[PDB]
Amino acid sequence: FDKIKSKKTGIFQNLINLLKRKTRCYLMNNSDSLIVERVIREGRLTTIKLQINFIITMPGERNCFLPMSKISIALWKGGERFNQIDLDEICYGLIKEYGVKTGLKEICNVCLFPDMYAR
Amino acid sequence: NQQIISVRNEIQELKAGKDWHDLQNEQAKLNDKVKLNKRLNDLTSTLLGKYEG
Amino acid sequence: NERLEAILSREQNLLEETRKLCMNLKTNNKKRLTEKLIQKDLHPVLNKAME
Amino acid sequence: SKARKETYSSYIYKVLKQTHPDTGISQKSMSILNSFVNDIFERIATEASKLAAYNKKSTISAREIQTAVRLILPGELAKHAVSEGTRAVTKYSSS
Amino acid sequence: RESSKAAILACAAEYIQKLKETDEANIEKWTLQKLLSEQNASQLASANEK
Amino acid sequence: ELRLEDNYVPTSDTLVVFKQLMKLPVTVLYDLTLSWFAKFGGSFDGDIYLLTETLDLLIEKGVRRNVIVNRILYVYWPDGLNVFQLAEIDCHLMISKPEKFKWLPSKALRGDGKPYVVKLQPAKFIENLQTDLAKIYHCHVYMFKHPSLPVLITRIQLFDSNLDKFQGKPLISRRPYYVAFPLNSPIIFHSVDKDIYARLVLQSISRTISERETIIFKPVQKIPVKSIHNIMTLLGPSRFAESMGPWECYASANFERSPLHDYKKHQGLTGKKVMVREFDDSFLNDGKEEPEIRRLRLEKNMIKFKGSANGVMSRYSSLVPIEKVGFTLKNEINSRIITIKLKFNGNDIFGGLHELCDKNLINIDKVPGWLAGENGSFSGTIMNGDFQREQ
Amino acid sequence: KQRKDSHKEVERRRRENINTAINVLSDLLPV
């Protein structure tokens, strides 16, 4: 549990470092989830909002007896939440391809920087 | 009696090969990658309008 | 003896119909790789995983 | 553990084969006939050596056994017994 | 580490043809790599200029 | 359809089976024959109790084994015994004299190259194997567990019809074949024969075990092994496998006791004693000696060839004696590769080498592990200081 | 004719098999 908490904080701090100056970002929920944000220029001051979760669960009930962790993400454009099934599968695939570290940095690249990215 | 044993041995030999496993794993990877590309293109367009779902 | 002939024929036909699927899968995989995710619609994200 | 037990059952069965070749023996009957010979052996030998002690002679011998058997057996069986003992010992000494 | 001479010859032939087969695929992969790399470079240059 | 049943009678030579029967003691004969009459009866007239008292009175009179064997072969079952009894006698022979039989190992593998831990319920296996084999040959199969090991053993025998003969209609026998299965391991043990019948058999086991995913058998060794105990020790699911030779004490695991064990008798306080080694090579150079240092020299040889000072199993007999091993060293000198191939033969190679070490013909400190006995029963090539089993 | 399976024929099969191995190896050579 101690080492996994340390790793959790490490992943968050690395993401914060990779995003801090280009997009200010707010760790919240007693260090469990963080928020990032950029203003889309397609529309006049169109905002895009993303927040991520890394929850650690202590054992006791239903497979093993060890502490284990979970990742999930959420996205909004203009306050409008995007359907969570496809977003979760995106999180799943990109994390599996690039791990949590580079995978989540790249999730933020996708979600907070599409306008650059169209081609 | 010889021929039956020979053909049975060939039948057993075929399905345990490395290539038979590798091709299926590769096909699964292709399917995953194409689905991921579809989803990424769809969502980035949705972020940028001009989406035409 | 003729019963054994029949058994031999059965094993041979099932062997052949199982054999063809390997070539089917190989060609299908090659074609799908070369067309579906090599054309220019690839999301530049997956460029790293693809290389 | 269990030590090997003395028995005459093989000889009893063999003499029954000589008498009635087609006949078998029950286990209880075989124990009975195994006890027969030991009982007779004792009640002959004790009387014979007691008679030897009456003679005040050291050796228990053929005459003592002959006298003991002819004392203790009923007479009709005793005649056969002494005749068979005498002919058996004679056949032996003729070796 | 084969021992018998016949096994040695068979393994040598198999190894030879396997090397020959591997070379062609190794050659083929590079063209796809070139395509992907130039596509990524062009995409990034378009990103920079736009 | 063609599956046989226990009441059928095969044909064979009577004298050979008589000689086979003579190996067994009297008591097992009594038990086997009582069971046979109980299940099948016999030509003899009388109740089993009558049979019981006849057999009894025969044995307390001290009759010889020949009488009982002749009775069995000529009055009780004069025309010949059933296939079941023929299998049973061989079962008892194997159990009584295990060292007379030879085995080979075989490893079960699945598609991805992983070991396939075979787990077997006997009923499904036996019915499936019988149905698979009956379509090609007439087969009787008998299955049993070893009295003192966690192994299931199977005996397979094949029959065919008829040199010339009229309408007697028997089926002539053939040399049997054997297979064994440990409870939870990827390994299979089977007899040493390469006739097409054995190939058909082994192929049938490989076909029938699967039931959910394909399975194939890959041999791991080319030289047979005797004494099913030994091959079980070497390759069965156990602690000794991959801890052989100098590494046996971990398989024993008695050196260490559980942590909550008492303090004062924990061996750490008490310790032990050992001998100091010497490294400048004085061996080839050359009673002027005293007991204690010689004692610990012998202990050094003991552990180098046995792994424990007390010498966990004479002082030379090893855990599993090895009859043959072939090694092949490959070393690089001045960019030139050099081959040395050693071949040993005997009843216990490493015990003999240990004896030579005791007689001081070989230097202990320069005996490598592969020569000492680790990788036991595996002939192979050594490169880069790492053993590699021969293909 | 003469029936026999011993020396003078059993070695021929071994020689032929090794020769075929040599031939298949040689077929792959550049020259």
From Swiss-Prot, chain B:
Coiled coil residues, start to end: 1-47
Domain of life where this protein originates: Eukaryota
Localization (cell): Nucleus; Chromosome, Centromere, Kinetochore
Subunit structure: Component of the heterotetrameric kinetochore subcomplex COMA, which consists of AME1, CTF19, MCM21 and OKP1. The COMA subcomplex is part of a larger constitutive centromere-associated network (CCAN) (also known as central kinetochore CTF19 complex in yeast), which is composed of at least AME1, CHL4, CNN1, CTF3, CTF19, IML3, MCM16, MCM21, MCM22, MHF1, MHF2, MIF2, NKP1, NKP2, OKP1 and WIP1. COMA binds the centromeric nucleosome-binding protein MIF2, and to the outer kinetochore MIND subcomplex, probably via AME1. AME1 interacts directly with OKP1 and an NKP1-NKP2 dimer.
Protein function: Component of the kinetochore, a multiprotein complex that assembles on centromeric DNA and attaches chromosomes to spindle microtubules, mediating chromosome segregation and sister chromatid segregation during meiosis and mitosis. Component of the inner kinetochore COMA complex, which connects centromere-associated proteins and the outer kinetochore. COMA interacts with other inner kinetochore proteins to form the inner kinetochore constitutive centromere-associated network (CCAN), which serves as a structural platform for outer kinetochore assembly.
Family indicated by similarity: Belongs to the CENP-U/AME1 family.
Swiss-Prot record, chain C:
Function: Component of the kinetochore, a multiprotein complex that assembles on centromeric DNA and attaches chromosomes to spindle microtubules, mediating chromosome segregation and sister chromatid segregation during meiosis and mitosis. Component of the inner kinetochore COMA complex, which connects centromere-associated proteins and the outer kinetochore. COMA interacts with other inner kinetochore proteins to form the inner kinetochore constitutive centromere-associated network (CCAN), which serves as a structural platform for outer kinetochore assembly.
Protein name in UniProt: Inner kinetochore subunit OKP1
Coiled-coil residue spans: 1-31
Note from the entry: Present with 2688 molecules/cell in log phase SD medium.
Species annotation: Saccharomyces cerevisiae (strain ATCC 204508 / S288c)
Location in or out of the cell: Nucleus; Chromosome, Centromere, Kinetochore
Family of this protein: Belongs to the CENP-Q/OKP1 family.
Region forming the signal peptide: none
Domain of life of the native organism: Eukaryota
UniProtKB/Swiss-Prot annotation, chain E:
Subcellular location: Nucleus; Mitochondrion; Chromosome, Centromere
Transmembrane segments: none
Quaternary structure annotation from Swiss-Prot or TrEMBL: Binds DNA as a dimer. Associates with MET4 to form a heteromeric complex which also includes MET28.
Reported function: Required for chromosome stability and methionine prototrophy. It is involved in chromosomal segregation. Binds to a highly conserved DNA sequence (5'-RTCACRTG-3'), called CDEI, found in centromeres and in several promoters. DNA-binding activity is enhanced by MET28. Required as an auxiliary factor for transcriptional activation of sulfur metabolism together with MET4 and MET28.
Note: Present with 6890 molecules/cell in log phase SD medium.
Name listed for the protein in its UniProt record: Centromere-binding protein 1
Taxonomic source organism: Saccharomyces cerevisiae (strain ATCC 204508 / S288c) (Baker's yeast)
UniProtKB/Swiss-Prot annotation, chain F:
InterPro entries, per the entry: Chl4/mis15/CENP-N (IPR007902)
GO molecular function: structural molecule activity
Subcellular localization(s) per the UniProt record: Nucleus; Chromosome, Centromere, Kinetochore
Cell division is among the record's keywords: yes
Main location: nucleus
Note: Present with 606 molecules/cell in log phase SD medium.
Primary role: Component of the kinetochore, a multiprotein complex that assembles on centromeric DNA and attaches chromosomes to spindle microtubules, mediating chromosome segregation and sister chromatid segregation during meiosis and mitosis. Component of the inner kinetochore constitutive centromere-associated network (CCAN), which serves as a structural platform for outer kinetochore assembly.
Protein name: Inner kinetochore subunit CHL4
Species of the source: Saccharomyces cerevisiae (strain ATCC 204508 / S288c) (Baker's yeast)
Upper classification of the organism: Eukaryota, Fungi, Dikarya, Ascomycota, Saccharomycotina
